[PDB]
Amino acid sequence: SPEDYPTPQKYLEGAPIPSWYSFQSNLVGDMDLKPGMARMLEVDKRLTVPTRTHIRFLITGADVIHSWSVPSLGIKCDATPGRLVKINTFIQREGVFYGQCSELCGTLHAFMPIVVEAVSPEAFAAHAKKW
Amino acid sequence: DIPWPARTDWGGHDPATPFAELMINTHSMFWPVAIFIYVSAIYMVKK
Amino acid sequence: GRRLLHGNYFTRYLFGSLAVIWIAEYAAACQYGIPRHRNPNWMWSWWLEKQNQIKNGEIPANTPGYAMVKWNNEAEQRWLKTLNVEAMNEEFARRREAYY
Amino acid sequence: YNLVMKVEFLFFYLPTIIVFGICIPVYTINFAQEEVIYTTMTVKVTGRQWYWVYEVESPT
Amino acid sequence: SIFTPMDWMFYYFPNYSRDKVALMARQIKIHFAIGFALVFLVYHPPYKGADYGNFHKSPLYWYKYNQLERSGQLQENLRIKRDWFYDEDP
Amino acid sequence: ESADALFVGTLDRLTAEHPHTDDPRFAFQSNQWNNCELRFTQFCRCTRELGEDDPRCKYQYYRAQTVCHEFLLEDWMEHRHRGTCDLDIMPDRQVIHMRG
Amino acid sequence: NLEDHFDLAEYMMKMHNPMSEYLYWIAGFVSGLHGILPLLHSNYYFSGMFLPRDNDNTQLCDDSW
Amino acid sequence: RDWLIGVMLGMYLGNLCVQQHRQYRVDMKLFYLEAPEHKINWVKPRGDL
Amino acid sequence: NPITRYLDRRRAERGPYYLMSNVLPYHPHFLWMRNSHDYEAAEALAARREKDRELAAKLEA
Amino acid sequence: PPTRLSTPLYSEGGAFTVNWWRNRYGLYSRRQTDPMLAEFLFRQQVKEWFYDVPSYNYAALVGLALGILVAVIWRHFLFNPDVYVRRQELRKMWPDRHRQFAYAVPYLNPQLKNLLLPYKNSFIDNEPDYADYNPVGLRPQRVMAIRRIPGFFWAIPQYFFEDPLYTSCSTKNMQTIYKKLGYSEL
Amino acid sequence: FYILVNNNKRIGIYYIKLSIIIGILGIVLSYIIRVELYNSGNRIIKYDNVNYYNMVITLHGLLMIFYIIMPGLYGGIPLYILPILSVITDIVLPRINNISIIIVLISYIVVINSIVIEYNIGTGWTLYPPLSIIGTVIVNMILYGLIIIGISSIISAINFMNILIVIDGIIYVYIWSIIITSVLLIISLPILNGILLMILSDIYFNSIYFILNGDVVLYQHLFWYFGHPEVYILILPAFGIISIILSVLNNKIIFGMKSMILAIIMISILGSIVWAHHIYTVGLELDTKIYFNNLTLIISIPTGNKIYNWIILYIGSYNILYNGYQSLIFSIMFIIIFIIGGITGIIISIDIIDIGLHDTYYIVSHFHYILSIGAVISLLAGILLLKDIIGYYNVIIKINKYFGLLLFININIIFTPQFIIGFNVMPRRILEYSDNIIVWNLISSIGSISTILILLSIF
Numbered sequence A: 001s002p003e004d005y006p007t008p009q010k011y012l013e014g015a016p017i018p019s020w021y022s023f024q025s026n027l028v029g030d031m032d033l034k035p036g037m038a039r040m041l042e043v044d045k046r047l048t049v050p051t052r053t054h055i056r057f058l059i060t061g062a063d064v065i066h067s068w069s070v071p072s073l074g075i076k077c078d079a080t081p082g083r084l085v086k087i088n089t090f091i092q093r094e095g096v097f098y099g100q101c102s103e104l105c106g107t108l109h110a111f112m113p114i115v116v117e118a119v120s121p122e123a124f125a126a127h128a129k130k131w
Numbered sequence B: 001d002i003p004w005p006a007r008t009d010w011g012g013h014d015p016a017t018p019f020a021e022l023m024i025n026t027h028s029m030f031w032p033v034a035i036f037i038y039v040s041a042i043y044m045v046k047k
Numbered sequence C: 001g002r003r004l005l006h007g008n009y010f011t012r013y014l015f016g017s018l019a020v021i022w023i024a025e026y027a028a029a030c031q032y033g034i035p036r037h038r039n040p041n042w043m044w045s046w047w048l049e050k051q052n053q054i055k056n057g058e059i060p061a062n063t064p065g066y067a068m069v070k071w072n073n074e075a076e077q078r079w080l081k082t083l084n085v086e087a088m089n090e091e092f093a094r095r096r097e098a099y100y
Numbered sequence D: 001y002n003l004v005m006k007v008e009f010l011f012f013y014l015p016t017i018i019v020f021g022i023c024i025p026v027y028t029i030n031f032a033q034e035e036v037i038y039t040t041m042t043v044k045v046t047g048r049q050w051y052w053v054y055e056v057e058s059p060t
Numbered sequence E: 001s002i003f004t005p006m007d008w009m010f011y012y013f014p015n016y017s018r019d020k021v022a023l024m025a026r027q028i029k030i031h032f033a034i035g036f037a038l039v040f041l042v043y044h045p046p047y048k049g050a051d052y053g054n055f056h057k058s059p060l061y062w063y064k065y066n067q068l069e070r071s072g073q074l075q076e077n078l079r080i081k082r083d084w085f086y087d088e089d090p
Numbered sequence F: 001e002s003a004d005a006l007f008v009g010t011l012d013r014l015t016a017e018h019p020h021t022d023d024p025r026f027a028f029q030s031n032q033w034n035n036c037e038l039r040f041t042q043f044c045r046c047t048r049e050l051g052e053d054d055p056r057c058k059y060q061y062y063r064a065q066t067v068c069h070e071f072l073l074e075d076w077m078e079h080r081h082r083g084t085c086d087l088d089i090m091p092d093r094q095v096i097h098m099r100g
Numbered sequence G: 001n002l003e004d005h006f007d008l009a010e011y012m013m014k015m016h017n018p019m020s021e022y023l024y025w026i027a028g029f030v031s032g033l034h035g036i037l038p039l040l041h042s043n044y045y046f047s048g049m050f051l052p053r054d055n056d057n058t059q060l061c062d063d064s065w
Numbered sequence H: 001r002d003w004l005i006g007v008m009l010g011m012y013l014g015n016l017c018v019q020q021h022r023q024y025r026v027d028m029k030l031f032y033l034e035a036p037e038h039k040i041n042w043v044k045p046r047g048d049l
Numbered sequence I: 001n002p003i004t005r006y007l008d009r010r011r012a013e014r015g016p017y018y019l020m021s022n023v024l025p026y027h028p029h030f031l032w033m034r035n036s037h038d039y040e041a042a043e044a045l046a047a048r049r050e051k052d053r054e055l056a057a058k059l060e061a
Numbered sequence J: 001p002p003t004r005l006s007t008p009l010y011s012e013g014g015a016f017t018v019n020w021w022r023n024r025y026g027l028y029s030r031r032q033t034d035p036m037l038a039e040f041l042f043r044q045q046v047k048e049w050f051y052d053v054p055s056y057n058y059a060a061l062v063g064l065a066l067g068i069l070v071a072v073i074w075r076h077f078l079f080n081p082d083v084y085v086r087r088q089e090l091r092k093m094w095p096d097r098h099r100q101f102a103y104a105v106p107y108l109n110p111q112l113k114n115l116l117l118p119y120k121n122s123f124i125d126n127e128p129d130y131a132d133y134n135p136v137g138l139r140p141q142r143v144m145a146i147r148r149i150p151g152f153f154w155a156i157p158q159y160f161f162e163d164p165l166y167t168s169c170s171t172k173n174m175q176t177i178y179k180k181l182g183y184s185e186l
Numbered sequence K: 001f002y003i004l005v006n007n008n009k010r011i012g013i014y015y016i017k018l019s020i021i022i023g024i025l026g027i028v029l030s031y032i033i034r035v036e037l038y039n040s041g042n043r044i045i046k047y048d049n050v051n052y053y054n055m056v057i058t059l060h061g062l063l064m065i066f067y068i069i070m071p072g073l074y075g076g077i078p079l080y081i082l083p084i085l086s087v088i089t090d091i092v093l094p095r096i097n098n099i100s101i102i103i104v105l106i107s108y109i110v111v112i113n114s115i116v117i118e119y120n121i122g123t124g125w126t127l128y129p130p131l132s133i134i135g136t137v138i139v140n141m142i143l144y145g146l147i148i149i150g151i152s153s154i155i156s157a158i159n160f161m162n163i164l165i166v167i168d169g170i171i172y173v174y175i176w177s178i179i180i181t182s183v184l185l186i187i188s189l190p191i192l193n194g195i196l197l198m199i200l201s202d203i204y205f206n207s208i209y210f211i212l213n214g215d216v217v218l219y220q221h222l223f224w225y226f227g228h229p230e231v232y233i234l235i236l237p238a239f240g241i242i243s244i245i246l247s248v249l250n251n252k253i254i255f256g257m258k259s260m261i262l263a264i265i266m267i268s269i270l271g272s273i274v275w276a277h278h279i280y281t282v283g284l285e286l287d288t289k290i291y292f293n294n295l296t297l298i299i300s301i302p303t304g305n306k307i308y309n310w311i312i313l314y315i316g317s318y319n320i321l322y323n324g325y326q327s328l329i330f331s332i333m334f335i336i337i338f339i340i341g342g343i344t345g346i347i348i349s350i351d352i353i354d355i356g357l358h359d360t361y362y363i364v365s366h367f368h369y370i371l372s373i374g375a376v377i378s379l380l381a382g383i384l385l386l387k388d389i390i391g392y393y394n395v396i397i398k399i400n401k402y403f404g405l406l407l408f409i410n411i412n413i414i415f416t417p418q419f420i421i422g423f424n425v426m427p428r429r430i431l432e433y434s435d436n437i438i439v440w441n442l443i444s445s446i447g448s449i450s451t452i453l454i455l456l457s458i459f
């Protein structure tokens, strides 16, 4: 029956169902670094998140075992193929938190940093709307 | 947020989540017990 | 002649272990209130309804499940081009006549 | 003998007490990580060689 | 015997300790049952232990609570010290 | 309307009204792989009954995205379109009960 | 025999030929080379140099040398 | 009996870190409440390079 | 690192607080970089600061 | 412990006694070649291992560790929703595994989890109750504990009513402060 | 003859000799690592040859564990004194003893040859899939070495177990230490072989265990089910040595012999059931995590009893006896150093603390303090005690206070800073790092070069 597939009434009335956006985050090369960038930690696309919000991070690894580590957020979850591990977080202060892959993943294990920037909820909404 | 030079950061530094604070305090809670275990044992290493 | 193990050790610890496992499992089910009635079927309600229609004669016999869905994948489109349920039923009817 | 036996008891059970003193804290912090929270947003993170892919819901 | 110097067990309970081999077996069995019971009677029991209106308040809790209640410290401690983010710049 | 309406009807409803929260059937474990597979199977069964254009099935896909990474969904969605997805084979063409 | 009483009698009685010691040290030296030589070979194979110059994979000042 | 001196010496040295931890928690409670180092509506997204 | 800066101030106010980072070099190439400069970065940084000042005045409005 | 072989050793009846141990100790022994020598060696071992007071401490530790171990294994098999030994549910797609889904919520709420979660305020200084409220209802609503965890938590006051800043660091006061700025909902 | 000899004492010498030789390669790799980590940049490895660093750390770990410390503490000292301690003429299985040492050498030659001939890539000494199974042939060669090493370890374990059948005296604590390690090997090795065969099947037989729908976490369970028992197979022989040295040099009978023995048995049983403390960050179930964390902390109890029983052995000893002998100093240093390593182990045992400290140099320093300092010093102390019996000379070690002091100071300069960078945090198994971690990395590097220089003064 249609009711065996629960859907909120707003969407049944024509509300747009949300889409998803994917982006790739890569290390900034040594020759591409700018005067102020932190070597071995900067990336070309950061992950922006709102502060004072409960966020669920689902982490997996496509090919080999990586590990998503953000020391300031107290997160170190192994990105293992076949496991979609749930990590809940609640950021309390704005800033930019830098991390690095924490599982030997091949030649460039040392060259895939993790940069997360936490901004005010009003700022995050504007950013998400534009990007 | 980011490592800083010549920092001990014993137990962690700059938490930005309630869980991060928990981790730092768990280490700080046990640290005096570790010191007691060490000092109490080492003091008797002698003839 | 001196004994090291229980005189009936093999049967004792084999059947005994099985008994403890079975009894402990019943106790565990009672504490969590787990339904203990075995169902051998799938629970897709719409599918089970289509199957009743076949048993009632509303849907012709040997009609494939992809002949009843509102979305077909590519491989099932390939099959639909060669599907003839009416011919299949006639063939089965002929077999029954020959057998009897 | 009596004194020695008491020391040996302490050599074993003083560590046991310390372990028991950590046990309760360990349970609590483990329970805290695995707490069902009312999360309102999801960020999917995939790790590839050698970069991190991020999937986020787009504003409607 | 739990947290018991067995030298004491040998002295005060000589007949119960006469067979030291059997005594050792009971030591193992008793602590085995204690560990087993903890898992299935302290940890496992479902939907229990969530009565937070029944937090035990020991005699020491009340001694210290009444002492602060008698003075103004309890009221002062519970008062919210700041409920604004920014101070006003003159 | 009822306070416990979400639990009533199905366990599925809970995450349908709160997409970014734990599903009752998988909240005990951090690994959410099985959660993703159930959500995809539910999207597959919706289309068979209602079609791809139905808003319900479109939302069942959004729900699947909430727990399934894109690289897995794209692969599994290709298998589904070809007709090789094991979570979408029509039940009368399954082999799970054959030869054992 | 008295000569056979002690294991490795020549060495224990301090009469052994020094070449035995030299071979042992040489064997250890060769073992060490298995970590250095492939390092040099691999560096040249993928770069063209046997060893790098400190911080030559990063941006350097004009006067850096 | 001497081993007791070690217990007492290890209890004194341990208590020093207890006091540091005690003061640390007091400081942490005042960060989000009073510390001017805590700033909000401050960090702006950098954007893709 | 706002909590490292706050905690340093609190500790220093209470008693004698000594940081290695304050006295010692953080990199080993300091022995050779007494007079080293990146002049291209200097010009770019100055230009960006000038643009920032214009943006600040505009934002003030 | 007698020193003369003439003086018998007391034994209880059962499967772990002095008599039971004597019967089996010398089964694989090449040294117990006659009664006198066998008894001497048997009593030598019994004296050394069973009349040693500190040895009984390890007996307690092995029992406790093994009991926990057996029980955690059994609990997984009997109650964990993700451990399958029967196959009925494994012969069905995920949406149809109702009997296995019945283990989920009871297994999500063990007693010790309800008893110890309120004590997070002994590890968190700011907003220790940040995750207490949840409108769904899979788990109970959480209330912060009134006392510190017993043991090594000397850095915090024995009772939280003693702490001056405790109330001002709560997620409720923090929400008030930020809501007054229009900064965030939580 | 040389290769044909079956003498158990000669074979014991061979094990020590080969451990030192292979050890030279191990130390060289360690120097490469520390040199590279001296600053940020590339120092001795090109950015295009980063695969070599991954191979250096992998081989360092594997060689030091399986080809140096294990052959030295479980093959060397054991084969020389165990048959004497057991007042038996010779080892029970003479021909098996000969083949075991030959097997170790042959597996070493295979490994080093694979460095020279194969492409140099690394996947850690823990050979986690899928990375291990998508590599080149050097991984296949390393697997052959491990399997071959496993054969030697198991047959040597069988050899020691047979001493129970022939021992003509009392089973001393040291004999108990080896027997229990042998039991740990007999129970752990067969599981390792199985998982290694599965790695081979995926590498060489088109198996699919470590690709989607197959759980890669499976490998970690079976590997670490051998992994952690291995760390106690490497430490327990060291404990046995420490007991003999302290009793002999202090002229004091072992106190609580039965508690020492029962502590070793306890550590083994517990060590066989705590392996998943290496898998805390994978995402295991809450109850599993709590079980493993609880049982891991229990291991401290039996381990603590042994430490305190050692202390009372040194207490009260006669003052007239000279206490500056290198063997005595090393034995005492072991107690001081092992406590540091163990306490840090208890810290990392708390899983929530472990989230921050997994795959960081804090873990490195933890197991170095126990192995690179504690186990090495224990093997040195044991050999030094048996200098007269073994009969080696041409070294200045027996009475060398400079060597002991310099070693202790400099070894701590290397690994104490690695605890600090664990809260900085500097991940493990990396070569490049942020510029704000140079200070501590530089200090440790200065410590490594210095320790090597002190190794030359013994000759």
Ligand SMILES: CCCCCCCCCCCCCCCCCC(=O)OC[C@H](COP(=O)([O-])OCC(O)COP(=O)([O-])OC[C@@H](COC(=O)CCCCCCCCCCCCCCCCC)OC(=O)CCCCCCCCCCCCCCCCC)OC(=O)CCCCCCCCCCCCCCCCC
Binding pocket: G008, G009, G010, G011, G016, G017, G019, G020, G021, G022, G023, G024, G025, G026, G027, G028, G029, G030, K002, K013, K016, K017, K020, K021, K023, K024, K383, K390, K392, K393, K394, K395, K397, K455, K458, K459
């Ligand atoms: C960690 C380090 C620091 C440690 C510090 C702490 C140490 C604490 C103390 C430890 C003590 C442990 C216990 C010790 C017990 C000792 C017992 C003993 O002595 O036993 C007796 C035993 C034998 O004595 P014996 O009973 O008289 O034996 C008589 C013979 O059996 C019969 O006599 P023979 O003359 O007839 O002998 C036959 C001889 C015949 O010999 C000859 O004819 C030799 C001719 C000269 C050759 C010289 C070498 C030439 C090399 C050329 C290289 C050219 C390179 C060109 C490159 C060009 C590049 C462009 O040899 C052979 O035919 C075969 C030789 C095979 C072995 C040598 C292999 C060398 C390496 C090969 C590598 C190959 C790689 C191939 C790769 C291929 C890839 C495709 O002694 C030894 O074997 C010597 C031991 C010496 C050391 C003892 C320990 C001393 C204390 C420690 C010191 C520190 C050592 C540190 C390690 C080394 C660092 C480098």
Ligand code: HEA
Binding pocket: B037, B041, D014, D015, D016, D018, D019, K126, K231, K232, K234, K235, K277, K278, K296, K297, K299, K300, K301, K303, K304, K305, K307, K338, K339, K341, K342, K343, K345, K346, K348, K349, K350, K354, K357, K358, K359, K363, K367, K370, K371
């Ligand atoms: C011989 C080497 C050795 C030894 C003895 C130990 C001993 C211990 N180790 Fe191990 N460990 C390693 C070698 C060793 N370890 C290695 C090599 C790794 C990394 C492998 C890799 O990841 O690649 C590792 C990793 C490792 C981790 C992984 C951390 C991570 O991956 O992030 C953990 C955490 O549980 C751990 C814990 C322990 C514990 C709890 C002990 C206990 O045995 C310590 C017991 C000793 C004491 C506790 C001190 C003495 C006792 C007392 C003084 C009594 C009083 C003390 C108390 C009451 C607490 N070890």
Ligand code: HEA
Binding pocket: K016, K019, K020, K023, K026, K027, K030, K031, K033, K034, K057, K058, K060, K061, K062, K064, K065, K068, K069, K072, K124, K125, K126, K364, K368, K371, K372, K373, K375, K376, K379, K380, K411, K414, K428, K429, K430, K431, K448, K451, K452
């Ligand atoms: C017991 C094994 C052992 C020993 C002795 C050592 C010794 C040393 N190790 Fe160790 N190391 C490991 C086992 C060991 N290591 C393992 C298992 C890893 C992890 C591998 C991985 O990450 O995959 C590791 C990782 C490791 C790294 C991490 C690299 C990385 O992954 O990023 C570093 C450098 O920081 C390092 C440095 C050193 C140094 C400087 C020494 C020593 O040089 C310090 C100085 C001491 C000496 C020079 C004396 C040693 C002498 C002997 C061993 C011979 C003894 C023989 C007799 C007594 C007969 N080691």
Ligand SMILES: CCCCCCCC/C=C/CCCCCCCC(=O)OC[C@H](COP(=O)(O)OCCN)OC(=O)CCCCCCC/C=C/CCCCCCCC
Binding pocket: C014, C015, C018, C021, C022, C025, J069, J070, J073, J074, J076, J077, J078, J079, J080, J081, J082, J083, J084, J085, J086, J087, J103
């Ligand atoms: C000899 C005569 C013929 C006997 C023929 C027997 C044939 C079948 C044998 C199968 C293997 C043995 C177990 C049989 C179990 C039968 C009952 C059963 O189905 O149990 C199911 C039940 C769980 O089923 P699900 O509902 O699918 O899961 C719900 C969520 N967890 O599983 C079990 O209880 C069986 C599996 C565990 C068996 C062992 C007991 C568990 C504890 C093991 C402890 C191990 C450590 C050491 C213990 C030492 C002694 C205390």
Ligand code: CUA
Binding pocket: A065, A066, A067, A101, A102, A103, A104, A105, A106, A108, A109, A110, A112, D047
């Ligand atoms: Cu990815 Cu490391």
Ligand SMILES: [O-][O-]
Binding pocket: K227, K228, K231
């Ligand atoms: O490994 O401990």
Ligand SMILES: [Cu+2]
Binding pocket: K227, K228, K231, K274, K275, K277, K278
């Ligand atoms: Cu371990």
Ligand SMILES: [K+]
Binding pocket: K036, K037, K038, K039, K040, K041, K042, K043, K431, K432, K433
């Ligand atoms: K570097």
Ligand SMILES: [Mg+2]
Binding pocket: A102, A103, K358, K359
């Ligand atoms: Mg890891």
